[PDB]
Amino acid sequence: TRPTIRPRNDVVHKQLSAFGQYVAEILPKYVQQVQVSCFNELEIFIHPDGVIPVLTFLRDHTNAQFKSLADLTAVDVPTRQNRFEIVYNLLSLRFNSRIRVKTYTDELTPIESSVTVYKAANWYEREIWDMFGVFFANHPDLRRILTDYGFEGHPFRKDFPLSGYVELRYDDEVKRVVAEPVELAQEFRKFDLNSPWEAFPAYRQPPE
Amino acid sequence: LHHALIPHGKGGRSSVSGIVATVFGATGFLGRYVVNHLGRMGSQVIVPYRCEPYDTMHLRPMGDLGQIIFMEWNGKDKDSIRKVVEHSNVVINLVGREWETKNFDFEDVFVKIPHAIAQVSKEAGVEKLIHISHLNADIKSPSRYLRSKAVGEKEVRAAFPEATIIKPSDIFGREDRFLNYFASMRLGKETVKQPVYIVDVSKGIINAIKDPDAKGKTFAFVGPNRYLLFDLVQYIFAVAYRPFTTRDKVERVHMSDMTLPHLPGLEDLGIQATPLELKAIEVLRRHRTVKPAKTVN
Amino acid sequence: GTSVKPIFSRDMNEAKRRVRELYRAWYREVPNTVHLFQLDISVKQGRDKVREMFMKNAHVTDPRVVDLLVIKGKMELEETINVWKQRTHIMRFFHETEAPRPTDFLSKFYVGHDP
Amino acid sequence: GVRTSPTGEKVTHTGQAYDDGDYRRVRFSDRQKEVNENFAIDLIAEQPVSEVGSRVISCDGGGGALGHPRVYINLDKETKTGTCGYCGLQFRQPHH
Amino acid sequence: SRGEYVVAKLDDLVNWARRSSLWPMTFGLACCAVEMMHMAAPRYDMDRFGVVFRASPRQSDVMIVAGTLTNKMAPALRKVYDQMPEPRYVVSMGSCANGGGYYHYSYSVVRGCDRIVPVDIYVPGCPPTAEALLYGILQLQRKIKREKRLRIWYRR
Amino acid sequence: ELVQVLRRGLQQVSGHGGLRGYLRVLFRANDVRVGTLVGEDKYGNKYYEDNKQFFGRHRWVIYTTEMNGRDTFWDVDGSMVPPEWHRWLHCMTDDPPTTKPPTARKYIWTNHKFNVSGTPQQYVPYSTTRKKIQEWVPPSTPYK
Amino acid sequence: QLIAVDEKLDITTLTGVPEEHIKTRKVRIFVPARNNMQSGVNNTKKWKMEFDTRERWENPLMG
Amino acid sequence: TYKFVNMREPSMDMKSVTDRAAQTLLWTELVRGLGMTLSYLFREPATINYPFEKGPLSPRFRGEHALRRYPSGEERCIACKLCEAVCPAQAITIEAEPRADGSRRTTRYDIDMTKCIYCGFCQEACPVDAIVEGPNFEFSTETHEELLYNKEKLLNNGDKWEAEIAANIQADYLYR
Ligand SMILES: CCCCCCCCCCCCCCCCC[C@@H](O)O[C@H](CO[C@H](O)CCCCCCCCCCCCCCC)COP(=O)(O)OCC[N+](C)(C)C
Ligand SMILES: CCCCCCCC/C=C\CCCCCCCC(=O)O[C@H](COC(=O)CCCCCCC/C=C/CCCCCCCC)COP(=O)(O)OCCN
Ligand SMILES: NC(=O)C1=CN([C@@H]2O[C@H](COP(=O)(O)OP(=O)(O)OC[C@H]3O[C@@H](n4cnc5c(N)ncnc54)[C@H](OP(=O)(O)O)[C@@H]3O)[C@@H](O)[C@H]2O)C=CC1
Ligand code: SF4
Ligand code: SF4
Ligand code: SF4
Ligand SMILES: [Zn+2]
Structure with a gap:
């Protein structure tokens, strides 16, 4: 591994593995999987019912005390039965470490709101609802935060079109801004960039 | 049909409707609505103008890129008319002045200009022509307005046999002079009026462009209800919450509206005329700081 | 089988109750909305539009979808009451500037290739 | 090598010119039409054919790294001349 | 005659008068407002041309749109444009x-x-560049x- | 002291060809500084430098009063500078096109043109491609 | 705590899609064929969903 | 390491209290700020005399686009479509066909300058130095239509700015 290759830290990998095993042991009721990546990141996979217990444990426990909510977001994977996965990123100032917690849901199953655990989660859950349509139960005030008033649909879903369905302009007859079906003078050009001759053998999937 | 003029798209802002229309006098009250209706469906509009471009600025957002073209012209020259209607297949005449200027009298405005426009359009091969005159345009009219309108209608029909004559009846709208003048006063019981909505006239013109059998026909655009002048002004003042142009306009407004049941109207163009009761608030809400008028049928 | 987690209602009856509550609230709000926004529409056709929007989702046979639609309608009502919208957002429900799309076979055949 | 349309428009190097019945000509009235006066085909036709005493010649368009990628041209066919795929320059062996 | 001469001179x-004192209001929607403010910086000094810094919309002569216009924002921009006195321009x-x-x-x-x-x-x-915007002005x-x-x- | 600054002011008045040229430059460029002449432009632009001024003000151009077809006594703009003097004037190089001129090419414009927006010489976009589909031409002879 | 309802899933009213872009379109489910210009097979592993092709016309300006 | 910005203890001796009272009653810091502003008035301003004086620029500056050509006079573009593929804003549209002499040349080359982000990716993707971003920036336009450049406009821009473009490329090409 000469200078063009990224250096690998063994000590952090072992520490994160040990802490993941520790967290898995303490909460067997919810934790489903623990992973440590080759660039020293620890993410924990839990059941949806354990969002509040796991987050409260990670925030309040003396050994964890992850007091800072770095980010909360969602990822849309249409091929899964549970369409959306919910990702929590946490930072610990006491021990100078970062942890990730992943959850899953679909269109109709609500997720428990974590505003009681982290005050920062309010606007993040509002944005998740606005962009993906994931409902959060017991939220103080859940409503759109980014889309226009009266906007229909959720744009960050994979089946939503890039340019949407309606566009805006000014009409002199009605003397106001109106919404009409979208027509583009030049259609967005779609490029097929993926090549054959796979790049990374280490990620090859079984031929099923 | 010249393939580049074949309709395409879904009838939207960036579609192609196959209409290249020249709208003379498009900077007026009806011109803006005509240009807007033509541009919202993807047709190209050539806007001839004599006014400062600043006064034509409001027509810029009515069409997509390249779909609206502004050219300078004057009525006393035929070369400008030729170069404006050279490539158009539809020509609409909306030129008209309600008063008399020192350089353009009613004769020039309503006889010589429409005749020259029709002659040049016929010589250039323009397929369709739409001309606008008044409903009360009769040769023996006391007012010079309607006399000149009748003479111009006759000469246009002579010059362009396939032209369509449209006779609206004292159009009212947001930028009209009917309701605005009646609300700016702050005689009657013998004069009956027949107001017509601006959007109805615009849709009628668009349909006449689209309608194939309306080539040499003459249309009368009239509203749903006939009103006596006194109670009409009463209703106008009541809407505005208010307590109750030199020589020609007063004798034209005291004059009654004609009735020509033989001429086709808006209903033959598939338009349900909107009653004045719906748009009275729209027009007169700005004059402020229920009991509709009685009609005769 | 197919056990699923409730959002608000356990069956269809509570869903109908919430739908009726939301319809009542909208029916109250229509006249005040019409007056406050200085709309050119009448209260009658505004309430007719509310009725049409409620009828648009009349075929739903699942409580979760029903009360999620109720949640979205409550969000819209909250936006309308607090005057967070402008006249354009309210007037967008009527599509007064869109050409009327014909339905018969001949018209669609003449206009283009779109079925 | 700009030509003129029978109607009166200039013909571009790509050969574009609106036909007589075309309404889109109205965009050029009271204005002009943007046409480049230098045609690349005519300019490259005026270049002399280089004479080299080798079967294979290399061309980079001149200027080293300011030209095009370096390519090699075979000059065994005496019927025609070797033409660069990028620059258009022509090379030829000393026939006779 | 003198009739056209007097109107020509008064028009000039x-x-x-109108072009020697342009009072703009700026819609600082996005990062183009940064270059807008850099044109007001000491180097370019829009004020030295008679162009005041951040005039009120009620007595503004020209609207400068500097940034992305979103669908949520367009009605407000139109409303502000409507509230401008008639001799108005948009850049x-x-x-x-x-x-x-x-x-x-x-x-x-x-x-x-x-x-x-x-x-x-x-x-x-x-x-x-702020200099490009000055050229536009x-x-x-x-x-x-x-x-x-x-x-x-x-x-x- | 003050006498010195007044003397430099009178030298500025003298260096512009007297009071007439002084008023000319003051009302055309809003500046009365005098600098060494760098070169003369083909369209009539004059270029000056003064290395004692701070960076940015050490180079300037006095625009010509009559370019291609209009009177530019008052209406001057930055698009009237030819590309070589454009490179020198924006401090992209330390060498004026007089000491070393640009390379000569047959296709380079011999007459620089300013921005022609809002002029009958403005650019009008259009498609440069040919028609894709050819229509069938019915015969001129009848069938029966 | 569990409805245990039995009915096919339908989220049509919640997606915001216009009425005429739901029952008029025709999606295609397929494994994309291998590009014959190349012998690689890595692009023929997954399943693709695409809609029916609609009208494309030439812009009057710029073509 | 870390510092404290506002962790001082005011002195409570009589002299310090009297000094603070004099500061309160006589407005010493206000006068000091006034003096700062007054001094700053008597120094030369930083304003340049545009358009007679221009702001400094660099050979790396990205301005208006142009299409270049070889010294023989033939255009450098070979319709490889790398610039159109790399364009982050999809502002380039290209069509091509063999020429009358069999050369690989474009028949359409449009750049929408109202979509362009002026990133310069196109000129660094070009293998033959055909498309560049020239030094011109004073090309404001009165209509949206004139900012939609076609191949003729870009070739005209290249012929117009070739001297400065070539000088700038000669200056900067050893960093590429
Ligand atoms: C006492 C009675 C008052 C009654 C009301 C009158 C108000 C007071 C009158 C005084 C008005 C001042 C007018 C002076 C304007 C001339 C300015 C001149 O310097 O501009 C030049 C000339 O511009 C125009 O050509 C001048 C047009 C002005 C009109 C000419 C005379 C009009 C007088 C008529 C008065 C009659 C009034 C009757 C009605 C009350 C070009 O400058 P410009 O191009 O900008 O800037 C370019 C910037 N550069 C130079 C750095 C590149
Ligand atoms: C034995 C004979 C004795 C006779 C009696 C004489 C004794 C006089 C001794 C004291 C007199 C001084 C009083 C002068 C005014 C004092 C007012 C004052 O101190 O109020 C200040 C406030 O005063 C101000 O700050 C006003 C400034 C506003 C900004 C304007 C800028 C002004 C500075 C420029 C200089 C002005 C020049 C004035 C002279 C004008 C000449 C005509 C207190 O505010 P705080 O600091 O917040 O504390 C109170 C809350 N705990
Ligand atoms: N009550 C009504 O409003 C109805 C009007 N009539 C007729 O319908 C037509 C349009 O009416 P309307 O739009 O309301 O009237 P407007 O006053 O609003 O405008 C008339 C148009 O004609 C143009 N025009 C007027 N005079 C001249 C001229 N000498 N040379 C060139 N152009 C000129 C105007 O342009 P510019 O301002 O630049 O001069 C203007 O755009 C007119 O022919 C009118 O007579 C039809 C029935 C009633
Ligand atoms: S136009 Fe948009 S992307 Fe470009 S600098 Fe301005 S804000 Fe940024
Ligand atoms: S500069 Fe960037 S955005 Fe502009 S055309 Fe080139 S690659 Fe596209
Ligand atoms: S400009 Fe350059 S990158 Fe773009 S198509 Fe031509 S040769 Fe290829
Ligand atoms: Zn070569």
Whole structure:
């Protein structure tokens, strides 16, 4: 591994593995999987019912005390039965470490709101609802935060079109801004960039 | 049909409707609505103008890129008319002045200009022509307005046999002079009026462009209800919450509206005329700081 | 089988109750909305539009979808009451500037290739 | 090598010119039409054919790294001349 | 005759007055407002041309749109434009305002500010330099110098 | 002291060809500084430098009064500078096109043109491609 | 705590799609064929969903 | 390491209290700020005399686009479509076909300058130095239509700016 290759830290990998095993042991009721990546990141996979217990444990426990909510977001994977996965990123100032917690849901199953655990989660859950349509139960005030008033649909879903369905302009007859079906003078050009001759053998999937 | 003029798209802002229309006098009250209706469906509009471009600025957002073209012209020259209607297949005449200027009298405005426009359009091969005159345009009219309108209608029909004559009846709208003048006063019981909505006239013109059998026909655009002048002004003042142009306009407004049941109207163009009761608030809400008028049928 | 987690209602009856509550609230709000926004529409056709929007989702046979639609309608009502919208957002429900799309076979055949 | 349309428009190097019945000509009235006066085909036709005493010649368009990628041209066919795929320059062996 | 001479001279006077003092209000939507403020910086000094810094919308002469116009924002921009006294002009600054730019194929972006308001000058760039925006302002001044209102009223 | 600054002011008045040229330059460029002449432009632009001024003000151009077809006594703009003097004037190089001129090419414009927006010489976009589909031409002879 | 309802899933009213872009379109489910210009097979592993092709016309300006 | 910004203890001796009272009653810091502003008035301003004086620029500056050509006079573009593929804003549209002499040349080359972000990716993707971003920036336009450049406009821009473009490329090409 000469200078063009990224250096690998063994000590952090072992520490994160040990802490993941520790967290898995303490909460067997919810934790489903623990992973440590080759660039020293620890993410924990839990059941949806354990969002509040796991987050409260990670925030309040003396050994964890992850007091800072770095980010909360969602990822849309249409091929899964549970369409959306919910990702929590946490930072610990006491021990100078970062942890990730992943959850899953679909269109109709609500997720428990974590505003009681982290005050920062309010606007993040509002944005998740606005962009993906994931409902959060017991939220103080859940409503759109980014889309226009009266906007229909959720744009960050994979089946939503890039340019949407309606566009805006000014009409002199009605003397106001109106919404009409979208027509583009030049259609967005779609490029097929993926090549054959796979790049990374280490990620090859079984031929099923 | 010249393939580049074949309709395409879904009838939207960036579609192609196959209409290249020249709208003379498009900077007026009806011109803006005509240009807007033509541009919202993807047709190209050539806007001839004599006014400062600043006064034509409001027509810029009515069409997509390249779909609206502004050219300078004057009525006393035929070369400008030729170069404006050279490539158009539809020509609409909306030129008209309600008063008399020192350089353009009613004769020039309503006889010589429409005749020259029709002659040049016929010589250039323009397929369709739409001309606008008044409903009360009769040769023996006391007012010079309607006399000149009748003479111009006759000469246009002579010059362009396939032209369509449209006779609206004292159009009212947001930028009209009917309701605005009646609300700016702050005689009657013998004069009956027949107001017509601006959007109805615009849709009628668009349909006449689209309608194939309306080539040499003459249309009368009239509203749903006939009103006596006194109670009409009463209703106008009541809407505005208010307590109750030199020589020609007063004798034209005291004059009654004609009735020509033989001429086709808006209903033959598939338009349900909107009653004045719906748009009275729209027009007169700005004059402020229920009991509709009685009609005769 | 197919056990699923409730959002608000356990069956269809509570869903109908919430739908009726939301319809009542909208029916109250229509006249005040019409007056406050200085709309050119009448209260009658505004309430007719509310009725049409409620009828648009009349075929739903699942409580979760029903009360999620109720949640979205409550969000819209909250936006309308607090005057967070402008006249354009309210007037967008009527599509007064869109050409009327014909339905018969001949018209669609003449206009283009779109079925 | 700009030509003129029978109607009166200039013909571009790509050969574009609106036909007589075309309404889109109205965009050029009271204005002009943007046409480049230098045609690349005519300019490259005026270049002399280089004479080299080798079967294979290399061309980079001149200027080293300011030209095009370096390519090699075979000059065994005496019927025609070797033409660069990028620059258009022509090379030829000393026939006779 | 003297009739055209007097109106021509008065028109020149009015045009000089209108173009020598342009009071803009700026819609600082996005990072083009940074170059807008850099044109007000000591190096370029828009004030030295008679162009005041951040005039109120009620007594503003020209609107400068500097940033992306979203669908949620367009009604407010139109409302502000409507509340301007009649001798008003609009300058479109930057690619986002000119044609939607780098967000042209977006579901929440207005594909050009000219869908909402008429535009007099288009300033290209991403962003245009403060000097490029100054060039655009001077071009607007020349355009104002070119107009003729009293002549048109005389020949009508 | 003050006498010195007044003397430099009178030298500025003298260096512009007297009071007439002084008023000319003051009302055309809003500046009365005098600098060494760098070169003369083909369209009439004059270029000056003064290395004692701070960066940015050490180079300037006095625009010509009559370019291609209009009178530019008052209406001057930055698009009137030819590309070589454009490179020198924006401090992209330390060498004026007089000491070393640009490379000569047959296709380079011999007459620089300013921005022609809002002029009958403006650029009008159009498609440069040919028609894709050819229509069938019915015969001129009848069938029966 | 569990409805245990039995009915096919339908989220049509919640997606915001216009009425005429739901029952008029025709999606295609397929494994994309291998590009014959190349012998690689990495692009023929997954399943693709695409809609029916609609009208494309030439812009009057810029073509 | 870390510092404290506002962790001082005011002195409570009589002299310090009297000094603070004099500061309160006589407005010493206000006068000091006034003096700062007054001094700053008597120094030369930083304003340049645009358009007679221009702001400094660099050979790396990205301005208006142009299409270049070889010294023989033929255009450098070979319709490889790398610039159109790399364009982050999809502002380039290209069509091509064999020429009358069999050369690989474009028949359409449009750049929408109201979509362009002026990133310069196109000129660094070009293998033959055909498309560049020239030094011009004073090309404001009165209509949206004139900012939609076609091949003729770009070739005209290249012929117009070739001298400066070539000088700038000669200056900067050893960093590429
Ligand atoms: C006492 C009675 C008052 C009654 C009301 C009158 C108000 C007071 C009158 C005084 C008005 C001042 C007018 C002076 C304007 C001339 C300015 C001159 O310097 O501009 C030049 C000339 O511009 C125009 O050509 C001048 C037009 C002005 C009109 C000419 C005379 C009008 C007098 C008529 C008065 C009659 C009034 C009757 C009604 C009350 C060009 O400058 P410009 O191009 O900008 O800037 C370019 C910037 N550069 C130079 C750095 C590149
Ligand atoms: C034995 C004979 C004795 C006779 C009696 C004489 C004794 C006089 C001794 C004291 C007199 C001084 C009083 C002068 C005014 C004092 C007012 C004052 O101190 O109020 C200040 C406030 O005063 C101000 O700050 C006003 C400034 C506003 C900004 C304007 C800028 C002004 C500075 C420029 C200089 C002004 C020049 C004035 C002279 C004008 C000449 C005509 C207190 O505010 P705080 O600091 O917040 O504390 C109170 C809350 N705990
Ligand atoms: N009550 C009504 O409003 C109805 C009007 N009539 C007729 O319908 C037509 C349009 O009416 P309307 O729009 O309301 O009237 P307007 O006053 O609003 O405008 C008339 C148009 O004609 C143009 N025009 C007027 N005079 C001249 C001229 N000498 N040379 C060139 N152009 C000129 C105007 O342009 P510019 O301002 O630049 O001079 C203007 O755009 C007119 O022919 C009118 O007579 C039809 C029935 C009633
Ligand atoms: S136009 Fe360009 S510089 Fe201005 S905000 Fe948009 S992306 Fe940024
Ligand atoms: S500069 Fe960037 S955005 Fe502009 S054309 Fe080149 S690659 Fe596209
Ligand atoms: S400009 Fe350059 S990168 Fe773009 S198509 Fe031509 S040769 Fe290829
Ligand atoms: Zn070569």
